[PDB]
Design a protein around this ligand. Structure first.
Ligand SMILES: CC(=O)N[C@@H]1[C@@H](O)[C@H](O[C@@H]2O[C@H](CO)[C@@H](O[C@@H]3O[C@H](CO)[C@@H](O)[C@H](O)[C@H]3NC(C)=O)[C@H](O)[C@H]2NC(C)=O)[C@@H](CO)O[C@H]1O
Ligand SMILES: *[C@@H]1O[C@H](CO)[C@@H](O[C@@]2(O)O[C@H](CO)[C@@H](O[C@@H]3O[C@H](CO)[C@@H](O)[C@H](O)[C@@H]3O)[C@H](O)[C@H]2NC(C)=O)[C@H](O)[C@H]1NC(C)=O
Length: 361
């Protein structure tokens, strides 16, 4: 089993305890740590934060304590326009430029592979995304001749029935990718004026109409489209999406006025770090959709959908039962990395929970 963990660049700038650096990461927790995100300039992979080279080096020195640990650098991301990706993949000339720029970069900084986070290719991009993946892998193969261990190539893929059908040739890119991370935590939110859970595991006999927005459907669909179980990694959230209620109705379908108030540390409307949720929980009524097997909480006019230890072990048992390759966690810096916010003194409570289940049978 693989436990792929993302670490995000900007989490260094959070104040107080929210501030998180590579060295706060337990070398033995994950099997792969992914640094998000690299920029692209004059069609070449490039850094993003001013101190990326220091943090790269910090993250990669962890391989000194755990030698089996592999690290990767993710490209693209959310504040990286998909049109920007689009324009590079469609012109064989600039694509080849970017591809050739990658290996030396990873080699200089010490990464073991690249992670493609193009979010998201449209109907018009499907053909080129297939190409970028092919040629990139082809290049990683040609470079291993120099005598060094071959670089890995992975991609963070959408888990939405429509997004998959529109922009991904799943049968083609699995042959070429070392593993695929399924973004199974983006099923609600997206600005819809009703309350709902962004990452349920199951359909839930109740509000069905969506019938496609759950990890179970997403996983089953990918297997059917041609992706082999041993390359699929299922995404597990370490954050929750919040909502400001528009009425006193707290149950399913209740109306919503907009995102939830910002977290004291993460400072962004609509999402909350798990360690912030640990604190939000005191004084809140907690609930659990039993059909979907994920919790949610309320306090005043704040409604929060999140993942506790229990729901996360549950998801982990599921991927074990469908024989997937492992779990992907977004993100280490949102978990209780210090272990001083959630009660029971344990650093990385959610990621550890996943790791425990994966370490059993
Ligand atoms: C749950 C989660 O991880 N959400 C991510 C988004 O938050 C993230 O966007 C990033 O937004 C933050 C603020 O929300 C940006 O932080 C700023 O970063 C710059 C340095 O680049 C720093 O000067 C600022 O102090 C800092 N402060 C602010 C305004 O809060 C961050 O730059 C954004 N990401 C990038 C690559 O620049 C998106 C990003 O793609 O990812 C979500 O996962
Ligand atoms: C990530 O890479 C992108 C694209 O390579 C960068 O995009 C900008 O910022 O690039 C230029 C240069 O910063 C911006 O300004 C131009 O800068 C030159 C000289 O440096 C100047 O003479 C030009 O006339 C412009 O004034 C453009 O506005 C941006 N282009 C685009 C499409 O983004 C970006 O800076 C990088 N982002 C980070 C955070 O590294």
């Amino acid at each position: 089993y693989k436990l792929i963990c993302y670490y995000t660049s900007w989490s260094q700038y959070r104040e107080g305890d929210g501030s998180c650096f590579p060295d706060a990461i337990d070398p033995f927790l994950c099997t792969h740590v992914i640094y998000s995100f690299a920029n692209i300039s004059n069609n070449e992979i490039d850094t993003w934060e001013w101190n990326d080279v220091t943090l790269y080096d910090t993250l990669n020195t962890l391989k000194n304590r755990n030698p089996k640990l592999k690290t990767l650098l993710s490209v693209g991301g959310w504040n990286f326009g998909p049109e920007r990706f689009s324009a590079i993949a469609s012109k064989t000339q600039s694509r080849r430029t970017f591809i050739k720029s990658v290996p030396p970069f990873l080699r200089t900084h010490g990464f073991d592979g690249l992670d493609l986070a193009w979010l998201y290719p449209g109907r018009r991009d499907k053909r080129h995304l297939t190409t970028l993946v092919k040629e990139m892998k082809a290049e990683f193969i040609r470079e291993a001749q120099a005598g060094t261990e071959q670089l890995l190539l992975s991609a963070a893929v959408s888990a939405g029935k429509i997004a998959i059908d529109r922009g991904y040739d799943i049968a083609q890119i699995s042959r070429h990718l070392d593993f695929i991370s399924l973004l199974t935590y983006d099923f609600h939110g997206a600005w819809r004026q009703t309350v709902g859970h962004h990452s349920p595991l199951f359909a839930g006999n109740e509000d069905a109409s969506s019938r496609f927005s759950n990890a179970d459907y997403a996983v089953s669909y990918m297997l059917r489209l041609g992706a082999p179980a041993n390359k699929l990694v299922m995404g597990i959230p370490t954050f929750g999406r919040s909502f400001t209620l528009a009425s006193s109705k707290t149950d399913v379908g209740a109306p919503v006025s907009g995102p939830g108030v910002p977290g004291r540390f993460t400072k962004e409307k609509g999402i909350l770090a798990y360690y912030e949720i640990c604190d939000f929980l005191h004084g809140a009524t907690t609930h659990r959709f039993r059909d979907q097997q994920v919790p949610y909480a309320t306090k005043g006019n704040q409604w929060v959908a999140y993942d506790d230890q229990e729901s996360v072990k549950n998801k982990a048992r599921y991927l074990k039962n469908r024989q997937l390759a492992g779990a992907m966690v977004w993100a280490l810096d949102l978990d209780d990395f210090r272990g001083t916010f959630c009660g029971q003194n344990l650093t990385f409570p959610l990621t550890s929970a996943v790791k425990d289940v994966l370490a059993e049978v």
